[PDB]
Structure formats: C-alpha cells, structure tokens
Design a protein around this ligand. Sequence first.
Ligand SMILES: *[C@@H]1O[C@H](CO)[C@@H](O[C@@H]2O[C@H](CO)[C@@H](O[C@@H]3O[C@H](CO)[C@@H](O)[C@H](O[C@H]4O[C@H](CO[C@H]5O[C@H](CO)[C@@H](O)[C@H](O)[C@@H]5O)[C@@H](O)[C@H](O)[C@@H]4O)[C@@H]3O)[C@H](O)[C@H]2NC(C)=O)[C@H](O)[C@H]1NC(C)=O
Ligand SMILES: *[C@@H]1O[C@H](CO)[C@@H](O[C@@H]2O[C@H](CO)[C@@H](O[C@@H]3O[C@H](CO)[C@@H](O)[C@H](O)[C@@H]3O)[C@H](O)[C@H]2NC(C)=O)[C@H](O)[C@H]1NC(C)=O
Ligand SMILES: *[C@@H]1O[C@H](CO)[C@@H](O[C@@H]2O[C@H](CO)[C@@H](O)[C@H](O)[C@H]2NC(C)=O)[C@H](O)[C@H]1NC(C)=O
Ligand SMILES: *[C@@H]1O[C@H](CO)[C@@H](O)[C@H](O)[C@H]1NC(C)=O
Ligand SMILES: *[C@@H]1O[C@H](CO)[C@@H](O)[C@H](O)[C@H]1NC(C)=O
Ligand SMILES: [Ca+2]
Length: 1373
Amino acid sequence: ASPSINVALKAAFPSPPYLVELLETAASDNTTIYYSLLDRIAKGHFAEATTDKALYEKFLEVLRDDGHMDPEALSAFKLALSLRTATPRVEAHYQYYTATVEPSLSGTQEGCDQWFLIDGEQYCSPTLDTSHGKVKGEDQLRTLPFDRKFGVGSRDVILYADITSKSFAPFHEVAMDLAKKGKASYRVRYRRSPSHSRESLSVNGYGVELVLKRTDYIVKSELAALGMKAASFVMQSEKPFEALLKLTQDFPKYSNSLGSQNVSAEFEAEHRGNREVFLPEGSNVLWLNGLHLIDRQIQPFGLVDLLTRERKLIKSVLDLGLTGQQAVDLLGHAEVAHAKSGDDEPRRFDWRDDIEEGQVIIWLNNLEKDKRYKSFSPSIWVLIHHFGHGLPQIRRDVFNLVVPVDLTKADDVKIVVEGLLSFVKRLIPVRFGFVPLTPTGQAIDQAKVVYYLLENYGLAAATAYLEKSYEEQSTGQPNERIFNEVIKDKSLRPDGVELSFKDIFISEKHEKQIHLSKHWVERLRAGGDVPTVFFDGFPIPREDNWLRVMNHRLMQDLQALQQAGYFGMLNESMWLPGFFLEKALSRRNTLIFPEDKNELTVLNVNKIYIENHDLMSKVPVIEASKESTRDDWAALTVVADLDDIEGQELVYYALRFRKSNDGVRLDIVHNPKDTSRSPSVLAQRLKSREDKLLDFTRFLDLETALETGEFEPDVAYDASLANFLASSNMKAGDNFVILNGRVLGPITSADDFKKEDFEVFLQAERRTRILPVYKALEDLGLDDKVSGPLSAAKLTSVTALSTISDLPQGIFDNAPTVRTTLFKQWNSTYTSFEVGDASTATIFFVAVINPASEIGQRWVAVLKVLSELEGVHLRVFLNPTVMIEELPVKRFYRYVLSSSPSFDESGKVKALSARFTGVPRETLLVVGMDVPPAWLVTSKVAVDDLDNLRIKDIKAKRGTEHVEAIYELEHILIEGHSREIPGAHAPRGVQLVLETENNPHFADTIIMANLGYFQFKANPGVYNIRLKEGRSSEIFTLESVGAKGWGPIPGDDNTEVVLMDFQGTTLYPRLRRKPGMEEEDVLEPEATKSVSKTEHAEINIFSVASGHLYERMLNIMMASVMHHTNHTVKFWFIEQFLSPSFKDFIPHMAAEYGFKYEMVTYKWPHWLRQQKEKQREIWGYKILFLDVLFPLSLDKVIFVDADQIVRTDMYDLVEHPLDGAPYGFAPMCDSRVEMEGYRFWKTGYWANYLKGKPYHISALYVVDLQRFRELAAGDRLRQQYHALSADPNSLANLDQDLPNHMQFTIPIATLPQEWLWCETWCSDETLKDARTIDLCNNPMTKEPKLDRARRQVPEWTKYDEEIAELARRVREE
Ligand SMILES: *[C@@H]1O[C@H](CO)[C@@H](O[C@@H]2O[C@H](CO)[C@@H](O[C@@H]3O[C@H](CO)[C@@H](O)[C@H](O[C@H]4O[C@H](CO[C@H]5O[C@H](CO)[C@@H](O)[C@H](O)[C@@H]5O)[C@@H](O)[C@H](O)[C@@H]4O)[C@@H]3O)[C@H](O)[C@H]2NC(C)=O)[C@H](O)[C@H]1NC(C)=O
Ligand SMILES: *[C@@H]1O[C@H](CO)[C@@H](O[C@@H]2O[C@H](CO)[C@@H](O[C@@H]3O[C@H](CO)[C@@H](O)[C@H](O)[C@@H]3O)[C@H](O)[C@H]2NC(C)=O)[C@H](O)[C@H]1NC(C)=O
Ligand SMILES: *[C@@H]1O[C@H](CO)[C@@H](O[C@@H]2O[C@H](CO)[C@@H](O)[C@H](O)[C@H]2NC(C)=O)[C@H](O)[C@H]1NC(C)=O
Ligand SMILES: *[C@@H]1O[C@H](CO)[C@@H](O)[C@H](O)[C@H]1NC(C)=O
Ligand SMILES: *[C@@H]1O[C@H](CO)[C@@H](O)[C@H](O)[C@H]1NC(C)=O
Ligand SMILES: [Ca+2]
C-alpha cells in the first residue's frame, strides 16, 4: 500500500516433492520414525492428500497419534519444515543418482521406474526373475552419510525409488519382509520423480538490508542519548518485544522521532550496577543454557541444530525427575565448571631410572657436586627467602629435565649440543638429562657408542664425540674416523672398569643398557611421531617452543615450593624433587592421558540403554554391590574380541578389578572380528556362568568357560549388537573400555590396559566427572534422584557432553567451552522482559542486546521466531552506550523466516519475501543480503539499480512506487582447515582438485597459510578431493579430509565429501609428508603459457563495475579493446557486483565482438577482516584474492578499470618483460607541471616511505599469476591488509596503497608511461603517444565523468552508439 520494496531468494536446484520432504524432516536422526512412516505411505494412506497443506495436516495427526512427537517436538518440526532443511538432503540423492547411477547402469531403461540392486544386478520387478544388467562403475554399497539401514543381513539390498507413485508400495513390502526375516539389510535411495515439475525452490532463513549510502549529512549531534532513550521507549510501550522489532527494523527513520514526551525515564541508571559487575555498555551477547554463542551460530539453521542437540541432552536428564530449570542449573554449576578448568591441577609421572637400575639417563649436570655451583649454598632457606625475577641459586637437586633424543637425527642431536649445554654453561639451577631414542638400527648402535664412552672415559669424552659428530659429519651411524680421534687425546685416564674399544656387542652394555632404555621410553610413552619431554614429571611434547612452556611450569613449581616452606612442610633432610613425585604414577597411559587434552569421546548413556535394550539385557552383567555407597558407584562396560588373546586378557583384568571395587557395575560386550559365526554364542556361554563370574582363581578358568557349552544363535541379539557398534562408531574385532560413557580405545595390546590401569581410569574419571556432579547435584538438593550405578552414569555422562566443543578451539574463537551462570547476579526489573513459561521450558535463552546496534536488528528478528516455539524461554537485557561518535544505525532490516509453514489458496506452500513498507521517497539506498555463512548469492531478476535506489526516480521513470528484485542461491560452500602431520602446521601453496564421478575436475583452489584455509563453490551431492597432480602429490599424501571433526576420529581415513545441508560442509583435512621431505611446493625442483591461451584466450582481461553507468562504461572499454586488436580475448568479471541487466546482456556482446567471458567470485573468509563499505569491498577483491579467484590453468591476467578506454593492441602488455616480478603497474604522471600542489605522494609519509620508489596507479596492471602464486604474494597481501586494517584511517584507496606499501617486500615491475594517460596529471602533448586513458577524479573541477568522456575522447560516442543500437536490436529481437 505505502511505497514498498520486495526481495525474494530462490535456489539453484528444483523443489523436491513435498511428500519426501516431510518424511525426511519428520524422521531427522531416527530411523524407526522413517520406516514407521514409510509403511504408512506404502498402505496408500497418504494418497488421499491432494494438496501440500492437506498432506502437511495429515502428518501432524499421524505423528501425534503414533507417539512419534510431543508438543515440543511438533513445534520444532513445523519451524524446520518452514526452513526447508530437508530439501538439500533429498537433492544429494538425485545428484548422486544422476552422476554415478545412470552412467554405470548399462541397458535401455523404460518401465524401470523402481529397481533393487543385488550383487551388481538390477531387477525392475519385485518378482525378481530377470536381471537387466551387470552394473559398471565404482561400488554403490558405500555406506554413505544420507543412507538408512533397516535390519541386519548377510546380503545387502538397495531400492532406488520414486515414492510419489503407487508403483512403489509392492517393491517396499518385498524387502521390508525380507529384512524382517533377516535374509538381508534394507536401505532406500531416491530417484528424481517425473510427477513433479522443474520449478525452482524458494528459500528462507536470510536477511535483507537497505543501506543509506549518504551518511555525510549530520549537523544535531545529541547522539549519545539515542541508545538510552530508545531502550526506555520499549520498556514504556508495554508490548515490548514488538516495539523493539518495529523500532529496530526501521530505526534510521525514527532517530529524530525519539526524545519525545519526557522520554529518558532513567529509572535504569540503577541497572548499571549490572554494568559495574559484568558487561560493558553497547555489547551484544547471547547464551543458550549457559553456552555462549558466537555470531556465526546465530542464524536459523545454526540455532535449530543447537536446540535439537540440547533437548536430546536434557530429556535424558529429566527422566530422573528434574525440571528443565533444575537440569540447566546443574549443568552450569560452579563445582562442574571448576573441574574443566581444573587442568591447572597438574598430573605428574615418575621420570626416575630407579626401575631401570640407574642405567638409562645420561645427565650433563649434578648440582650438589659440579664445582660450577660451588659458589652456591646448599640450604633450604635459600629457596624460601626468594624475591624478584631471578631463579634461585642453590647447591641442591631440585628441578630436573629429561628429554628423549634420537642420535641419528641432526635436529635432535643439535638440541643436546646447543640447547642443553648452553643452559649448563649458563649455571641454571636445573639438572639436564637426556635419553636416546632407539627406533632404528643406527640409533641403537649410537646409543651403545655414547653409553660406552661415558662408562669408561667419562661425560666430556661422550659429549666430545657428539659435538664433533654433529659438526658437518652430522653422523646417522657411528663413525670411527671421528670416534678414534676422540679416544686418541680424550682417552687419557679412562677410570675404573677397563675398555672394550671399536666393537660393541657387550652382553650387558648392549643388552641391559639398550633394553632398559627402551623400557623407560615405553613406560612413559615418551616416543613416536612426537616425543615427550618430562620436566619435574610433567609431560611436555617436543613441539614448537616447549622450553617456553617448561619455563612456565618452572616458575609455577618454584612458587609451589616457597608456600610449603612458609608452612614448614619442608625440612633439611629431604630430596626436593620427591616433593613432586609424592603422588606421581610410575606408568603413563596415552589413552587416559592423551597429550592433546581435547582428544575425548563420550556417549549418551541413556541412549545406549534405550536403543539397544535387547543387547544390554542379555550381556553378562555383574551388578554393583547392595552394600555400597553413592561415592563408590560407577558403571563399566568392556567391549572385546573374545576370539583373540588381547580381547580375553583385557576381560580377565576387568574381572580382577571388580573383585576389589564392590561399587562398580560391569558389562561384557563380545565384539568379534568375524561375524560369519554368530556373536550370540560366546555371550550366551558367559551369561550362564554370570553368577560364578570373578571366581576365576586363574586365567585358564575363563579360557575354558568360553570354549565349553552348546548354544543356539539369538539372532535378535546379533542385530542389536551391530547397531550398538555402528551408533558408537566402533570397528569389528576392536577392544574398548567404557566407564560412565567415556570410551577409550581401540586397545591394540591388552598389556596397555591392566587391572592397575582400570583403577587409575576410575580414580581420574571419578575426580573430574563424577565428583563435580555429586557435589553440585547435592548443593541443589537433587541427590535423591541417583538410585544406582547406571542411574548415576546417565547424569555424569550427560554433563560431560554438555561441555563438548563442536567447533574446534582456535578457529572461530579461542575462548573455552564453559557454561557461565554469571548473569544470574544481575537485577532485572527495569531492563528485562521474559517470554515463555520457565516452569515448562527446556530451552533457556539470555539475550543482551544494544538497541542502537545494527547486529541487534538481526538478533531481535531471529529471537522472536524462536521464542514462538513451545518449550522455549527467553529473557532480554537492553544495554546501550553513551559513546556515540557517529550515527549508530545506518540501514533498514527485514528477516525472511516463519515459525510454521504458510499455505496457498490452491493449497501449495507459500514462498517467503522481505517487504519494506513506508520507504522515504528521496533517500538513496543500497540493497544488501545478510546471508548464512555457507551461502553464495547474486541478483538474478531486477530492473532497478540496486546500488542506487530512489523511489522518486523510479516513480518518475517507471510509474511505480513498488520495487521487486529476485536473487539466486547459486552455490553452497565446502570450506575447511588443513594441517600437516605430525608437526601440525598449515601446508601453504598446496593445490587441491574437487571431483565427481561425472567429471574429475569440478573445481580447484590453493591452501592458504591462514588456518590452512581453502574453499569450493558447490551444490548438494557426493564429491571427492584429490591433491593436484604435480609438486603437491610429489611431496604429500593426504590421509584424510576431516569430515568427522578435528579428530582423528576412527573411520575418517577417507577423502569423501558430501553436502546435504544449508550449513555446507566444514572439513579438517590432514596431510603427512612423504619420505624425508623438507621441500616446499612454491619452489620448483614449462608448457605453462600455451596451455592457458589454448583453454582461455590470447589476452585475459578482468574488471568490476558497481552501477549502471560503470557497467555502461565497461561495455565501451571492452569494445575499444576489440576494435584495437586482431587477437583472441577473454573477459573476466567479479560476478556478484554486476546487475542482472548487465549479466543478461553480455552473451549478445560476445556474439557481436567475438570474445569469450567467464564469471568468477570467492567468498570473503570468516577470519579475514571485512569491509562495511561496499566500495572498499570491491577494491579488496581486486588485490586480496588474485591467486585464488582465477583457475590454476590461467597463466596471467590484466586488470582494466571500467571508466577506461584503450587504443592499443593489448597483447603488448602480456609480452612486456616483468623481470621476475609477480605484477606490473604504471606510475603517476609527472608531465603536468602546474598540478604539483595536488601531488600528495611527494609529502612526508609517502616520500619518506617510498624513498626512491614510485607511487603507482591501480586503474591498470598485469599479474603473472603463475609467479604470483609461486612467490606466495597473496598471503602476504592478506595478512598485511588484516594488520593494517585495525586502524580505520589506514588505507584511503587500498587498491593503490597496498601494492605501494608492499613494493619493498613484493617487487612491482614499473611500466612505461605510454601505458597511461589522465588529463588531471598528464600534459596534452603526452596524449599523442598514450596507449590507454583513465578518467581520474577532477579535483580542481566538479566536471562529471560523462562530460570528461565526450570532451576528452571523441570516439567515445562512436562506441556508445554501437552498444545503443544493439541494445535496441535485442529489445526488438
Ligand atoms: C526414535 O524413535 C522412536 C519414535 O520417535 C522413539 O521411541 C518411541 O517412543 C514411544 C513412546 O513415546 C514408544 O512407545 C513405547 O511402547 C513401549 C511398548 O512397546 C512402552 O513400554 C513404552 O512405555 C514408556 O513410555 C510411556 C509413554 O506414554 C505412552 O503411554 C500410552 C499408554 O496408553 C501408549 O499408548 C503410548 O505409547 C504413549 O507414548 C510412559 O508412559 C511409560 O511409563 C514408559 O516409560 C512406550 O509407550 C515407541 O515404542 C517408540 N517408537 C515409536 C515408533 O514410536 C525413540 O525414543 C527415538 N529415539 C531417538 C534416538 O530419537
Ligand atoms: C540490585 O538491586 C539492589 C536493590 O536494593 C541493590 O542492593 C544494594 O544493597 C546494599 C546492601 O546489600 C544496599 O546498601 C547497604 O545496606 C546495608 C544494610 O541495609 C547498610 O548497612 C549499608 O550502610 C548500605 O546502605 C544498597 O543501598 C542497595 N542498593 C540500592 C540502589 O538500594 C543491588 O546493589 C543491585 N545490584 C545490581 C547488580 O544492580
Ligand atoms: C584487423 O583485420 C581487418 C581485416 O579483416 C583490418 O581491416 C581492414 O581495415 C581497413 C581500414 O580502412 C578497411 O577499409 C578494410 O576493409 C579492412 N579489411 C577487410 C578485409 O575488410 C583491420 O585493420 C585489422 N586491425 C588490426 C588492429 O589489426
Ligand atoms: C517535561 O515536559 C516538557 C517537555 O515535554 C518540558 O516543559 C519539561 O521541561 C520536561 N521536563 C521536566 C523535568 O519537567
Ligand atoms: C622431615 O624429616 C623427616 C625425618 O625426621 C622425613 O620424614 C622428611 O624428610 C620430612 N617429613 C616429611 C613429612 O616429608
Ligand atoms: Ca579509474
């Protein structure tokens, strides 16, 4: 009605049938709901629903009536159905079917609408008599992400069906029954149904913004009160949530309208008592049950997935009679969070030689007897009376450091010789030791050599051999030429026991010493890929700057000694290192104590005993004792292959451990490697002997009990068994241990997990997870709700999962995964308002919004729709700032989202749009899309200039006050963060190729230095990532694409990526270097040009335009090139900054002028610093992404500005020698003399910085892309831009200023000035020899660009007329 603007978004793929969408949305994770519904529709039950509304209506009654959903879950189903979350999941099936099924299915298909696939044979009938084909191509038995399985069976059957028709129902029942019998396992895959049309999909869950492009006009500056008055207006209204939405959506319009009718109502200067304690004014912060959410997680898709995960967690808890409110309170409790932070409590391991009889550690020091430290006092009070920054001097043994070193490796040897000795020489009060690593023959020999040389001759002689050997010989294997010289002089007085010389094979020296050393390394797991250093029994892995970390603990240990001294705990007759070893463990388990602390897996216990009840009621169970306490209670489950020694060894130890601990409740799950013989037999053998369990005096009693007895197969048991392992992601024949939901394994050798190792696992686990749950729980007085070991495990397991990081630490935010309760302190009467019932709510939201913020605009819109869900509680806090330097909100905002689907008059599903009403007639606006992270969007239909919108002009020109535009969700991102193995660094310069069965080259990108970042533009389907052929595959092998998580998670040893969601795909790939390489991709160890020219063109020019004029000028620029060269040209454009009017026109320009064109884009990385102003974005696209924006096949490109015109045959620029420089620019004209005043690059900062170098122009330049990438110029530009950008007034014009700031670091080839002309800075005499002309800014005039063109260049009109006639010719065509 009022003058309005309407914007809609549609996907790049057609809308799947509504029926299949409801099936998938309804049965999210649950297969039972899936096939239970698949039965209902195969009855022909859902055939009477003629329309989408009716069909949707029928599902609601069914789900409620069959017990599938409750109100909470039904409300959530409607919102997820609005979002159309299941549509990309269905399109995954179709892309897979179109690209891998159809080309591998040889024959003539007609009548084969549905067909099972069995043993590479296709059957178009349920009767199964005839096989049409032997299917070619790769295996279709890939158990892949979108699959579902029904039943267990030796044979595997797949049905590719078009569910829509009733031709489907008989096929289903044939395999449903065959799976019910157990003959084979059933799974359904989809077929694109021809009953549905090729209508594109209308999407929602995005935002639209109308940005004011002129903010320059402000006079009166009483901005300070806006946030404060805006906050009060809402509190006053008494319909507060609606006020905020209405105010926040059209905020720029209401600025002057605020401050009316004694408006301040500052009761709430009182609630800065709230500010005083916790958050600073004007900051937006959201919490979900204590969890702090980052901005990227605050979209509809991100939020729906969080509720889904959180409810599953809470529901499990409230089956013990806890309210949603009590449950959440327990999760964010102080004692709980303290335990997570409780790795300030360090655990130490006993580093001593005492077990290995003193023959393994070779110390470089003794502080009590070295006559270096002779100066120092051997008194305790020296330690206690210390102040300052210095480390206390003392003649006593107090601090120790043992570093395991490989003597083959020069890097390892250099550590001892340079690193360790400097410290000795420096007179540090730390004793330095080292133990050789013996993983190769050469290493073993050199340990012998060095050990011998110490034994008879002494430390200096051994030291001497190492020092000598390192310098140049850098010996892998022992060298006599160097060894014998050492003895020749250093063989003076080799004391005590006599020499052997040259040859070592001493029965005791080789055996005892080397094997004792191996026993030490093994005992503390101090070896492998990454060795482990032990400082005071504290493991520090040998990586990056471990000394930095060691020094940190050295100061933290010193302060630990001082405090004991002031309490008089210490005494003069003491071994001070033993203060730390008091509670140290002799053996170190990498399973329990992984050095990457994040490496942890916990399962929902409630889930395990709900889904697999059939299995868990039939496993041999030892219930915990009747006379045992809540503290003693713990639940253990052992998963082991009883067909292997390791598997049965492990169980005997678990049984032994149970005799000792009466509080434990044990379960034994037999997981065999071979499932051709039923697993139920060996389980049945033990459950008979269950009563007599742990009366096995000896191990053979268990061995014998497993072998004896005759049993049938419970095939029901077998099925639930295989389901459990699949749910728990466990391999067959692999050993695992589960105490209170926490899984450790796979156990390679049962010697790793002994009786003593179960006791520690319970000791440590108990501490962290069980004792903080017990305390916290009791503090709230909920300690009546724990009724047993299994009852307890459900609570402890759930609260450990609550503090689980889904997003790896260090990527999106460094801050740890901790639930705060710190906002509960805050008074709420005058700043807060709540929505939803707290008593019933399972979800609790705490929003802290600043009304004056632009981020608040989005937050309000999304929160209102999620508040509409049943079982959700929200509480809002408004916190504005008094510090407002500039206008706070400079845009209008609308969020396209509904809490339940909308239907047509003809019953179809309604599409959703952003409609802005009551738009000011004379304000200039810019349309922008506030799209979820994974999405790539461009304008498809629009007749207006979306960069320059004004209603008065449109009304005058078109006659309409109403504007309509349509966008397209063209691509969805596959983005990931790489790392090298084992010394994890980002592998920069690595090239990647994305592929599909149809084509082996979907896309290509290069790995960046920052987070090993990379991205691909794709849509739903099954893909694969291969390292690009060349140097990348030569140096590396990629073990995995981290699709499962950071991991390594077992089963992720793959390179397969699939996208079936609107959140795209986030990956954490891993790459390990090939045999002994220190090589770099960027550096070579020839037909590189020809190739690009053949594929693309003789000339490759790229550009960008942000307005109808600039697009009109761009048409002229391209034409001028074409008239001026009889060569082949390819034009490249930055896709998203162009209008659809321009986009729709170019094929007609390409036909006329005879050139090729290609649209390119890259999404601005999340880590890289954004640009609020679009003009600045555009400049960034020209300089920051040059290496990644164009395909690797392209040798070189040339940038030409839109306003330019060229009289030259452009090849010349290609041939121009750049003398090994990545890119070439043209300098600023010095020819105009009278202009000097406006030459600002002869001033202090630019003349000081550019000592002799020129001030270049970014209107035209060459980029030798192959060299650019080779030199890794892009990553420097990116990181310097990010660093420089922290200062807002940094780069006036970043495009010109970044290459000029980087010309010292990155060479710039300077171009002949024949290459550029501009009236402003070049003389009129110069134009005769000019090659190209930029229309640079006035600035001594106000004459506009249209005027300069016609006056400056006479042939500009000739070009404009040619374009004008063709546009009219197309309009009439
Ligand atoms: C995956 O799939 C399914 C479906 O979403 C989830 O589990 C379903 O939940 C049903 C209950 O809501 C369950 O019904 C149970 O039937 C068994 C007998 O086979 C009963 O022993 C159970 O009793 C428990 O639940 C009831 C709930 O109220 C029920 O009472 C009326 C009585 O007239 C019943 O007619 C009706 O089923 C009501 O729901 C409690 O009152 C009891 O005290 C007791 O605790 C259930 O009634 C279904 O068998 C089950 N499957 C389906 C297809 O519905 C499953 O949890 C979900 N899991 C995941 C991982 O998502
Ligand atoms: C939340 O609102 C309450 C409202 O009262 C604020 O309470 C403050 O509490 C202290 C004492 O707890 C009050 O003053 C002191 O009281 C004692 C005993 O009556 C008296 O002996 C002292 O001399 C002193 O007067 C204080 O006045 C009161 N504040 C106000 C404004 O009344 C609380 O600080 C608020 N907190 C937040 C986070 O906003
Ligand atoms: C590109 O090739 C064409 C030949 O097709 C050249 O065009 C000739 O130019 C004169 C200009 O007065 C015309 O009168 C002739 O009729 C053209 N020849 C033909 C065959 O029609 C053109 O000059 C070449 N341009 C460049 C830059 O190489
Ligand atoms: C209250 O009302 C009017 C402005 O609406 C003004 O006359 C008066 O100064 C305002 N403030 C106070 C404290 O009375
Ligand atoms: C104090 O001296 C005693 C010997 O009298 C000895 O146990 C130890 O060195 C000190 N005591 C403790 C508890 O460490
Ligand atoms: Ca320009």
